[PDB]
Amino acid sequence: QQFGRDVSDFTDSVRDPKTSEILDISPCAFGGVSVITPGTNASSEVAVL
Amino acid sequence: QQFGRDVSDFTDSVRDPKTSEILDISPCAFGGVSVITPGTNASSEVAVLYQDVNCTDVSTAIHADQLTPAWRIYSTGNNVFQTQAGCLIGAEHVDTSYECDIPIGAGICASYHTKSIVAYTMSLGADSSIAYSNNTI
Amino acid sequence: AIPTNFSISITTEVMPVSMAKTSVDCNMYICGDSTECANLLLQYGSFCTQLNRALSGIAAEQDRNTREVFAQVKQMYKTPTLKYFGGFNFSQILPDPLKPTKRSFIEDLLFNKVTQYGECLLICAQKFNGLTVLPPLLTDDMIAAYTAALVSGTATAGWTFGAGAALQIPFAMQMAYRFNGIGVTQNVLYENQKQIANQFNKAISQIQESLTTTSTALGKLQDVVNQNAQALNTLVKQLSSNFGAISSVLNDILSRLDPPEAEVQIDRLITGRLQSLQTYVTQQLIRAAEIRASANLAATKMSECVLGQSKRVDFCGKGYHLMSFPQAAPHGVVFLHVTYVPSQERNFTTAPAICHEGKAYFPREGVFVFNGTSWFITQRNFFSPQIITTDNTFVSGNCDVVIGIINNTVY
Amino acid sequence: AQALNTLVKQLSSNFGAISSVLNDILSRLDPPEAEVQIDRLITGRLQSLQTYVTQQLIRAAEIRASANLAATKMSECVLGQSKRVDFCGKGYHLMSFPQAAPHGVVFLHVTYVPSQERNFTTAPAICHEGKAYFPREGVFVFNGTSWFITQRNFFSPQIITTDNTFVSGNCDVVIGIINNTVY
Ligand SMILES: *[C@@H]1O[C@H](CO)[C@@H](O[C@@H]2O[C@H](CO)[C@@H](O[C@@H]3O[C@H](CO)[C@@H](O)[C@H](O[C@H]4O[C@H](CO)[C@@H](O)[C@H](O)[C@@H]4O)[C@@H]3O)[C@H](O)[C@H]2NC(C)=O)[C@H](O)[C@H]1NC(C)=O
Ligand SMILES: *[C@@H]1O[C@H](CO)[C@@H](O[C@@H]2O[C@H](CO)[C@@H](O[C@@H]3O[C@H](CO)[C@@H](O)[C@H](O)[C@@H]3O)[C@H](O)[C@H]2NC(C)=O)[C@H](O)[C@H]1NC(C)=O
Ligand SMILES: *[C@@H]1O[C@H](CO)[C@@H](O[C@@H]2O[C@H](CO)[C@@H](O[C@@H]3O[C@H](CO)[C@@H](O)[C@H](O)[C@@H]3O)[C@H](O)[C@H]2NC(C)=O)[C@H](O)[C@H]1NC(C)=O
Ligand SMILES: *[C@@H]1O[C@H](CO)[C@@H](O[C@@H]2O[C@H](CO)[C@@H](O)[C@H](O)[C@H]2NC(C)=O)[C@H](O)[C@H]1NC(C)=O
Ligand SMILES: *[C@@H]1O[C@H](CO)[C@@H](O[C@@H]2O[C@H](CO)[C@@H](O)[C@H](O)[C@H]2NC(C)=O)[C@H](O)[C@H]1NC(C)=O
Ligand SMILES: *[C@@H]1O[C@H](CO)[C@@H](O[C@@H]2O[C@H](CO)[C@@H](O)[C@H](O)[C@H]2NC(C)=O)[C@H](O)[C@H]1NC(C)=O
Ligand SMILES: *[C@@H]1O[C@H](CO)[C@@H](O)[C@H](O)[C@H]1NC(C)=O
Ligand SMILES: *[C@@H]1O[C@H](CO)[C@@H](O)[C@H](O)[C@H]1NC(C)=O
Ligand SMILES: *[C@@H]1O[C@H](CO)[C@@H](O)[C@H](O)[C@H]1NC(C)=O
Ligand SMILES: *[C@@H]1O[C@H](CO)[C@@H](O)[C@H](O)[C@H]1NC(C)=O
Ligand SMILES: *[C@@H]1O[C@H](CO)[C@@H](O)[C@H](O)[C@H]1NC(C)=O
Ligand SMILES: *[C@@H]1O[C@H](CO)[C@@H](O)[C@H](O)[C@H]1NC(C)=O
Ligand SMILES: *[C@@H]1O[C@H](CO)[C@@H](O)[C@H](O)[C@H]1NC(C)=O
């Protein structure tokens, strides 16, 4: 065996082709952003999530 | 007029090109398949339901090996009973009534008694009568 | 303004609780029995796995709606022999055992004013279109049996049948307690028990002649059939759409044209018919969410209105409801409404209290009505001169805290 | 869950395009040819995506039926006492204990159930000294010994006095008037 899959068809972990160490793969980051504001009336600073 | 069509728009009747005999064209029989099982912890036998079909053609095509799908190890056991839902094949017809456990349709339910899978008509509930007694409560 | 003389009449309420369950095999709807369509079909993906999970999920819920409305009953009580309960003529409502129908006289006229796809009714025939309409779980004889055990058992047990064990009661003892619900005394039933019974006997006779003569009081049950008819025929006529191919025929495109001319126009008519199949699946899934609403108006008007008596205004009968009658019907429920409609009021003078001993005298029930001659206590649903005594009125405070007290005496 | 496994398994579909991985379409095909085969994969992955929204959108309104049930069946049944027919259990509801469930609620309704019944002979009216007499609440109960009054949920005798007797109207009109002595 050389590389692992998850329940999907994505290869989530592989073995090193040179030094045979088995390495996870992680989807570096993603996600949404939301804007937490007090309203532009009372303020003009925001806070992102 | 060469041929006929139905209330839909495919042809179901034809005058014969060779000998002019007025024919009908019904499509071939088909439908869905259910499987009636009592549970793997319960047993390992099943009885299948073939939906919306005539038992004349279905019981024929099993022995003549004309069904797609076809099973590796299966036989009817000569238990073919026509409901309005279709030809229940593999369960034992019983003439009594009970409560419904696994439905089929048209007033027929099936369950797992003495063990084997049996089929019957539903009983709507307990039977009773109330006297209309003119002075009694 | 308080009445003295009322009416009892019958109002028909009509609801549907189920529509016709269908199912669709893809390989005869989509492919039309061609081979290469199925070769093209397995490259889209197993999407007909999910499109028979949906039309099974609806078809398994037309069994519950038929079962949650009617199968509230624990014990199937027999039809009693005499159908004449103190002048109450229950002949047309319970089924007549002389007919080979297992149906009452009402239900036979209901079927005869209401009165393309494969079906096995026995003669089983298939259609070229892969449209089947499977029969329901409960046949109409079982539906006409839960109807009959809801009018046999309630004629002999009343609200106890919905309360608990179906305890016996005379039906004249029954209706009198249903006058006790609407704040109306036992003497309104028993004194008037002749023409109470004889309006209700002719109120059933109205519904006969109203339904022998005409229709369209069953318009809701007609439209449940009509929305079945359109959504099948729209699913039928979109077979004949070209969708950019040279024809809508998958076997002409198969056989007549080139094999490069085929797969271009095979792949058009599948993607056309596939998302025309999904539009049908979605619009059944919305239309089966209105039935699930209007089968819960029936599973509460057969809980609350048929078993109990309802304290809810303009809910299962205009005016004050007394008893409810379920019926069977093609795809749905037809209710009948024994309603209390007061009438023929006259003007009466009211006043808040009595000034005697310099103290105010507060009623427990109703008003104080001046006769023109006399003061007395009544209720506002029928004229009832009950005279002011020592315990149907009580006391707190002196006079003239009420504006317009009576210089009277608590007798 | 099976809405999502519908959605994940439709990644691996080819949708009639050349392949189901974009780094195998862009690899083999050259960018004039690849970008038309990517478009049939994008549109295939959008039309299963928007359908997932609509199947979530109908099943969202299947719950607002059941969330306006539970908003009532807590704020009429725990927070009061229900006077309706088989709302909150079967019988005569007394209390209700709501629990908390994953993605739902759990109620504990306590009902009052009548039991242990016995016949007698009834009567709607008493002829006492020229009048017909009527019950205020209850029926005229005769257990073979005497005539008395009880309520329709529990059998307990009440002496027929004009305290609890609806005194109105003359004798010998009403159906079923029984000659007794009202005290
Ligand atoms: C499933 O398929 C089978 C066969 O494919 C089918 O069984 C057939 O049923 C028909 C009736 O439905 C039978 O036909 C009858 O046969 C008898 C004896 O041969 C005749 O006397 C009958 O004539 C009477 O009926 C005619 C039409 O109603 C009248 O015009 C006439 O005057 C007579 O009154 C009639 O021809 C046939 O014999 C069987 N065949 C077999 C092999 O069983 C079955 O009905 C199908 N079931 C479903 C649900 O589709
Ligand atoms: C109070 O309301 C009731 C019903 O709404 C009225 O009863 C009706 O009384 C009339 C008499 O004026 C009845 O007509 C007679 O009926 C008998 C039947 O035996 C018939 O033989 C006579 O020739 C005559 O037609 C009428 O039938 C009756 N209604 C019903 C439904 O039976 C009553 O008059 C009302 N009282 C007042 C003060 O308005
Ligand atoms: C309770 O209601 C029923 C209605 O279901 C009443 O039955 C009806 O009775 C009348 C009187 O006999 C029937 O009229 C006669 O019918 C015979 C039958 O053929 C006919 O020969 C006569 O010329 C006449 O038309 C009527 O048909 C009948 N209704 C039904 C549906 O059968 C019944 O009388 C009522 N109860 C009482 C005590 O009145
Ligand atoms: C009850 O009172 C109302 C008004 O107090 C009466 O209605 C009036 O009747 C007279 C005839 O007597 C008319 O001239 C008026 O125009 C009516 N007024 C209104 C507002 O309708 C009514 O007739 C009385 N009914 C009874 C039974 O006493
Ligand atoms: C019927 O009910 C009455 C009460 O309403 C019962 O009468 C009492 O019975 C007890 C026990 O036998 C006696 O000690 C009392 O003196 C009775 N009181 C009266 C007023 O009769 C009676 O027992 C009941 N009938 C039966 C068969 O139990
Ligand atoms: C209950 O009491 C009434 C009292 O009115 C009885 O009515 C009497 O009936 C008899 C014959 O049955 C007549 O001779 C009397 O003239 C009636 N009384 C009056 C005041 O006229 C009634 O019969 C009694 N119940 C039973 C079943 O006998
Ligand atoms: C390649 O050679 C290095 C040393 O030169 C060794 O550490 C490594 O394991 C080798 N890898 C393979 C795949 O042979
Ligand atoms: C804007 O903010 C002020 C105070 O900061 C407040 O009085 C006013 O009502 C707000 N108006 C709107 C439209 O938000
Ligand atoms: C199988 O059913 C029996 C019935 O009582 C039960 O006791 C048993 O635990 C079940 N098997 C498993 C693995 O749970
Ligand atoms: C019921 O009782 C009333 C009065 O006692 C009587 O007129 C009627 O005939 C009785 N009916 C039956 C069926 O016994
Ligand atoms: C009420 O008035 C009517 C007619 O004015 C009269 O016949 C009746 O006896 C009176 N009743 C009382 C209790 O005063
Ligand atoms: C009732 O009597 C009191 C005390 O005499 C008096 O003040 C009042 O005016 C009287 N009511 C009317 C309507 O005159
Ligand atoms: C009540 O009466 C009915 C018929 O009158 C009888 O069948 C039943 O056994 C009786 N039950 C009791 C508890 O007396």
Could you tell me which chains touch chain C, where touching means 3 or more CB pairs under 8 A?
Answer: B, D
Dihedral pair phi/psi, residue C58, rounded to 5°: -80, -45
Ligand (nearest to CA of C398): 12
Could you tell me which chains touch chain D, where touching means 3 or more CB pairs under 8 A?
Answer: A, B, C
Start-to-end Cα distance in chain A = 41
Residues sharing a CB contact under 8 Å with residue C188, sequence separation 6 or more, in sequence order: C179, C382
In angstroms and rounded to an integer, the radius of gyration of the C-alpha atoms of chain A is 21
Report chain D residues whose CB lies below 8 A from the CB of C289. Answer: 58, 61-62
Please tell me the distance from the alpha carbon of residue C391 to that of residue C377, in angstroms, as a whole number. 12
Q: Do D120 and B136 touch (CB under 8 A)?
A: yes
Residues 49..88 of B with a Cβ closer than 8 Å to C: which? 51-54, 82, 84-86
Report chain C residues whose CB lies below 8 A from the CB of B128. Answer: 75-78, 166
Please tell me the distance from the alpha carbon of residue C144 to that of residue C155, in angstroms, as a whole number. 17
Helix (H, G, I), strand (E, B) or coil at D147: strand
The enclosing H or E element of B56 equals: helix B55-63
Question: CA–CA distance from C303 to each of C80, C310, D16, D28 (Å)?
Answer: 23, 10, 53, 67
Chain centroid to Cα D137, Å, comes to 30
Distance from the alpha carbon of residue B120 to the mean position of ligand 9, in angstroms: 27
* Atom in ligand 1 nearest the alpha carbon of residue B82: 49
Q: Do B26 and C126 touch (CB under 8 A)?
A: yes
Please tell me the distance from the alpha carbon of residue C8 to that of residue C2, in angstroms, as a whole number. 18
Please tell me the distance from the alpha carbon of residue B72 to that of residue B91, in angstroms, as a whole number. 19
Chains B and D form CB pairs within 8 A to the count of 12
Structure-block tokens of residue D92: 């005569």
Residues sharing a CB contact under 8 Å with residue C311, sequence separation 6 or more, in sequence order: C181, D83
Nearest residue in D to C392, CA atom: D163
Which residue, among C288, C230, C224, has the nearest Cα to C54 in the 3D structure? C288
Q: Do B135 and C170 touch (CB under 8 A)?
A: yes
Residues 108..137 of B with a Cβ closer than 8 Å to D: which? 135-137
Which residue, among C338, C333, C324, C337, has the nearest Cα to C154 in the 3D structure? C324
Under 8 Å between Cβ of D48 and D7? yes
Nearest residue in C to D66, CA atom: C293
The enclosing H or E element of C64 equals: helix C61-70
Task: Please give the DSSP secondary-structure letter assigned to residue C138.
Answer: S
Q: Is A18 exposed, middle or buried (CB count within 10 Å of its CB: 0-12, 13-18, 19+)? A: exposed
Which experiment gave this structure? cryo-EM
Å from D150 to nearest chain B CA? 12
Taking each helix axis as running N to C, give the angle between helix C219-237 and helix C105-114, from 0 to 180 degrees, rounded to the nearest 10.
Answer: 40
Helix, strand, coil percentages, rounded to 5, for chain A: 0, 25, 75
Question: CA–CA distance from C346 to each of B114, C4, C243, C329, C343 (Å)?
Answer: 74, 9, 73, 43, 10
Please tell me the distance from the alpha carbon of residue C181 to that of residue C170, in angstroms, as a whole number. 17
Q: Does A8 touch chain D (CB under 8 A)?
A: yes
Q: CA-based angle C373:C374:C379, to the nearest 5? A: 125
**Quick check: bond before C95 cis, omega within 30?**
no
In angstroms and rounded to an integer, the radius of gyration of the C-alpha atoms of chain D is 36
Taking each helix axis as running N to C, give the angle between helix C35-44 and helix C259-287, from 0 to 180 degrees, rounded to the nearest 10.
Answer: 60
Resolution to 1 decimal place, in Å: 3.8
Distance from the alpha carbon of residue B96 to the mean position of ligand 7, in angstroms: 77
